[model samples]
Target: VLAKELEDVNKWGLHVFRIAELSGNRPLTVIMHTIFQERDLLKTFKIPVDTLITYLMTLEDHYHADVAYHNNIHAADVVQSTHVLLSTPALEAVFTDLEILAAIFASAIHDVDHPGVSNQFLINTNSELALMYNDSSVLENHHLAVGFKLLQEENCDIFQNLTKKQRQSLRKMVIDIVLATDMSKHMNLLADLKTMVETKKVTVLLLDNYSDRIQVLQNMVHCADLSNPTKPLQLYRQWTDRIMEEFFRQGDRERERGMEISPMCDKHNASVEKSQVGFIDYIVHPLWETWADLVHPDAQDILDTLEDNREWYQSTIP
Candidate 1:
C-alpha cells in the first residue's frame, strides 16, 4: 500500500522509497511518521502543514534528474542517516526540538536539484552559479537558493508558523548544515569537528556549554552525505551504481559541450571497483573513524557495516 503511494509520488526515478523498496527496508512509513510527529511537535510554531508537504514534493522532483547520482534516492538515504544519528543516546539530551527540526529539514533539502556535477565542475565550466557564488561551493549555494525559493510558494512555506526569532535561528541553522554538505568543505568541517570533540568543548543545545553546537550539526550532516559507501553491502552497491551513472552522464554532457571530462566522471576511465575502494580508504573511512570516536557506541554499528562493506568490495576486486 505504502509502496504504491511512493511509486505514484515518484513518477520520475527520483523516489527514495523506490530505493527503500529495492533494499527491502520499507522505511518510508517510518520516515513519514517521523516527519508527521515532528510537525506536530512544532505545531505551536504555526508552521504550515500543507507547505511542508509541498516542500517535500518539490524535493522529490529535485532528486529525479536525468543524470544519475546525488538524485532523490541519495537524498532519502541521507535523511534516513540523519534520523538514525538523531536517535543516538548521546544526542538524547542535547538537541532542542527546533534544532532537530532544522537538522532533519536541512538533510531532506540539502542536495535538491543537483545538476550531476561537482562545485569544481560548475566553476571550471563558468556556470552562472559558479560566477554568482564566486566559485566557492557554487553548487551548494545554488542548491540552497533553489530549496529556499521553493518555500516562497503559499503551500510550501514550511516555516510559516515560526516566531520571527525562531524563524531566524532555523534559517541560520539550516543554511549552515546544508552548505556544510558540500564535498569541498569536507576536510575543514571534519577537522573542526575533531578539534571540538578532542577539546570536549562541544555542547548539546539542551545540555552542555559548547559554543559550537551548530558546527557539530554541520559535521553530522556532512558525514551523513558522504555515508553511502559505508552502508550495508547491497545498499552501498546501489549507491555506487547510481553515482557512477550520474558521473558518466555528466561526462557525456561535457563531451557534448566540448568541455574536458573531470576525473571520475568518465565511465570508461573510472574503474568502478577501484574508485569505490579509493573513496572509502582515502575519504570515507578516516572520517567515519573520527565520527565513531566522537559518538562512541552510537556509530559503532555504522563502523562495522563500513568495514564489512569495504571487505565485500575487496573480494570483488581482481
Candidate 2:
C-alpha cells in the first residue's frame, strides 16, 4: 500500500513536505522504512524492522531545526529525489540491494548538521572547521565526519549486518557521494556524468566514485541534491525562499564582521528571480541536461517544469 501510493506519486514526484506531515514529521523514518519495505531490503539483509525504525528515528534527530536550509527536510527531499531517479525502469536494474541502500542513506545524510552557511563563510571567519579542514571543502568534510560519527553509535548502525568489506565499501561510497554534493565538486561530477552518457556505459558500477555505479549512484544523489529547479514550482520556490533567507543572514553577518558580502547574498542587491534564471542557465540546466540522458523519458516532465519555472522567472525579472 505504501510503495503503491509512492509509486503513483512518482508521476508528480513525492511531496516530501506533505509526506513529512503524514509521517508525523518523521520524514526520515517514513522515507527510509517505506523504501526498505518497498525494496524488500529487510528480507534481503535480514534486518530487524524495529532496529530499522530506531535508526531512522535517531538519524532524523541529527539534523538541526534552526537552520533555514540543509535541515532534515532538505535531506528528506533529497532522499525522495534519489528514490525517484532509481525508480526509473532503465536505472532500476543496474544496482544491487546494498548499493541502493547506501545511495538512499547518502542522500539523507549528505548535508547533516549543516551550519546554514556557505563554505566560504567559514573560511572568511577563520572558523575552527575551516582551519581544521585547511579551507579545502571545509563543510563537505565536516558534514561527512559528523554524519559518520553518528553512525558509529550502536543505535544508528543500519549497515551493521554487512560484512567488514561491505561496511567499508558502503562507507567509502557514501562519503564520496555525499561529498559530491558540495558545489565546488559540481562541474567535475557533471563532466563525469556527461562522459558516461556519451560513452553509453550503462552498467551499474558507474557509481564507484566518478565513481558510485549504479558509481553513477553518486551522480543520482548529486542530481537529487541539485534538483530544486526541476521540482514542482511551489516546492522549488519554497526552497528558494528558505535558501535566500539563509544567504541574506550570511550577508548580515559579513556586514557585522566588516567582511565582504557574497554574490547573491546581498539583500539590498537582491533579485531573486533574475539570480534563479541565471542559475538555471549556467548551472542547473547543464547538469540536468546530462542527467536527462542518463535517465531519459522519466526526466522529461521534470525538465519541462524546469523550463516553465525558468521562463516565469525570466518574464518577471523586470
Candidate 3:
C-alpha cells in the first residue's frame, strides 16, 4: 500500500502528508529508503542496508511526534522537495553523486529533533539550546549535533565504509547546507544567490568553483525548506494550518510567561489570510523567484502555483 503512493516520488507534487498515514508514521524512513535506493547511495557508499534503515528509524524518533509542524513528516517533505529540486532539467548531471547524497542527507536531518519553536523563541526564553549555542543559530546547531550524534550509535553507522576524507567532505557539506536553513541567514543567502545568478547570467551552475557549487546547494535546501508555499494550494494550506498551530502554541507559552507574543502567532488576533499574503509577498515569492531565475523554465510551474495560492489567500482577506 505504501509503495503504491511512493510512485509519486518522482513527481514534484508528492504528497508526503498522505505517505505519513500510509507508512504508519514512518514517512522519513520509507521515503529515504526509496530515495537512497533510487540514487544508489547504498551501493556507492557501501552502507549496509540494515544499518541505514536502523539509523533512519532512530533519526525519525528524534523528531517530536507531538510537534505540530517540525516532525518526521516535515523532514520527509523537505527531503522529497530537495530531491525534486536537485533533479531540475537545468541542473541535470551538474552535481556529483556525492554532492547529491550530501544534499539529500542534509535535508533529511535539517530539522531533526526540532522543538516546534523558532530560534527567536529559544533565545528569548533563555532555552538551554540557546545557551549551548550562545544564541547563534541555536536550533540549527542543535539539529546538527543531534543528527551527527545519532550516527555514532552501534549498528547505525550509515557511512561506515566512507574513507576519512570523503566522510570529512560530506560532513562539512552537510553542515554548510543545513546551517543555511536558518531563517536568520535568509537575507544574506538570498543576496548571495541573486548576485551569483545575476552576475553570471547563466542558468547552469559554475561546475569548477567550490563556492559557487556549495552556494547553489545551500539555496536548493533553503528553497526546499521554504517550499510549502510553492506546493499545490491544498497541500500548501495544510502546511499553513500545521505551522500556524505551532506558532499559536508558542504564543500561548509567551502569554503564560508575560512575554509579548510573536508576529502572526497570536491565534486570537492573527489574520491567517493576511499573514499568508504577506508571507508569500515578502518571503516565499522573492526566494523562489530567484531560484526560478537560476533554474530557468524548469521551476516555472512552482512559481505559478505560488502565485495562484497567494491570490487565493489574498482573496480571503477582508
Candidate 4:
C-alpha cells in the first residue's frame, strides 16, 4: 500500500522521494495522514478529519509541481523534518501542544505557492508579490497570507474548534516560524540562536521563556528547510539535482530578460559539487553546528551526517 512508505514519517532522515514515488507525487497526503495522526493534532484540535483532508488537498494544489525544488514534496519533507526535530528527546514536553501544532502547520505551508525563484529575483523583476509585500519578506508574507486565507473556506477550516484567542496565537506563531525561513535573515537568525544558546537555560526553564520558545521553533523550521545536506547521500544528491534545476531555470529566465544571472543560478558555470561544498561549509554547517550546540547530543547524528555529506561532495570536485 502507498501508506506503507510512510511508516517512518517520524524518522529523522525520512525518504520523502520514496513517499512521492509511492503516493504518485502526493507526498503531502502521507504528511497529512501521518504527521497529524502521529502527533495527535486532529484530536487535540478537534479538527474534522475530512476538513483536514480537504484543506491539505487544496494546499497541495497550491504547490507548483513544475518547480523542480520548491514543490509539494519539499513542503512535506519540511513538515516531516520539523516533526522529527520537535520530537527530539531533549525537547520532550518543552513545548506546549499548541506550539507543536503551530510548528507543524508553519512547516507544511512555509513554501506554498513558491515561484521557484529567490526573493531578490522577485524584487529585481518587480513581481506582484514583491510589490504586495513591499519587498520585505515577500515570499514569506505571501506564504503566510495564502496559507491562512485557505482556512477561511467553509469546509477547509481545520482549526474550526479553536477559540478566538487560540486562533490568533497560532497565527502569530506560524508567521514567526515561516518568516524566519527567508535566506536573507540567515546571519541575524543564526546569531540570535547562538545568543540564545549561550545565554538561555532552555532545557531547564522549559516553559518560562516565551520569546525563546519561538526563536527555537523558528530555528527548528529553518533547520528543516536547510536539512537536505544533512540527509543520506542518495537523498541529498537528489535534492541537489532538483534545486539546481530550479536555479538553472531561473537563470534561463534571467537570460531572456537580459539581466545579470544570480550566483549559483548559471547552469553552465555553477559547479554542482563545489557549491554543495561551500553551502555546507558556509551556510548549512554553521547553522547546524549552532543547533547541535543548542540541543546537545540529540543533534549530533544530524551534524555527523552533514559532515559526511560535505566530504562526499568535496571528493567529487575536479
Location of the lowest summed lDDT over 10 successive residues in candidate 4: 200-209
Per-residue C-alpha lDDT of model 3 across residues 287-312, encoded as one tens digit per residue: 99998898887899999999989989
Runs in model 2 with CA error above 4 Å? 1-12, 201-215
Note the Cα lDDT for every prediction shown: 0.72, 0.79, 0.91, 0.90
On residues 185-208, what C-alpha lDDT tens digit does candidate 1 reach at each position?
788987887876686633422335
Encode model 4's per-residue lDDT on 1-318: one tens digit a residue.
666767888787787888888888789866767889998888999999999988998899899989999999999999999999988877888999999999999999999999999999999999999998999999999999999999887699999999999999999999999999999999999999899878757533354678889999999999999999999999999999999999999999999998999999998799989999999999999999998988887889999999999988998987
**If both were scored by lDDT, which would come out higher, candidate 1 or candidate 2?**
2
What clash pairs does model 3 have? none
Error of 3 at 85 (Å): 0.6
Error of 4 at 177 (Å): 0.8
TM-score of each: 0.86, 0.91, 0.98, 0.97
The candidate scoring highest on lDDT is 3
Which stretches of model 3 miss by more than 4 angstroms? 201-203
Error of 4 at 205 (Å): 6.3
Model 1 root-mean-square deviation:
4.7
Global lDDT of model 1 = 0.72
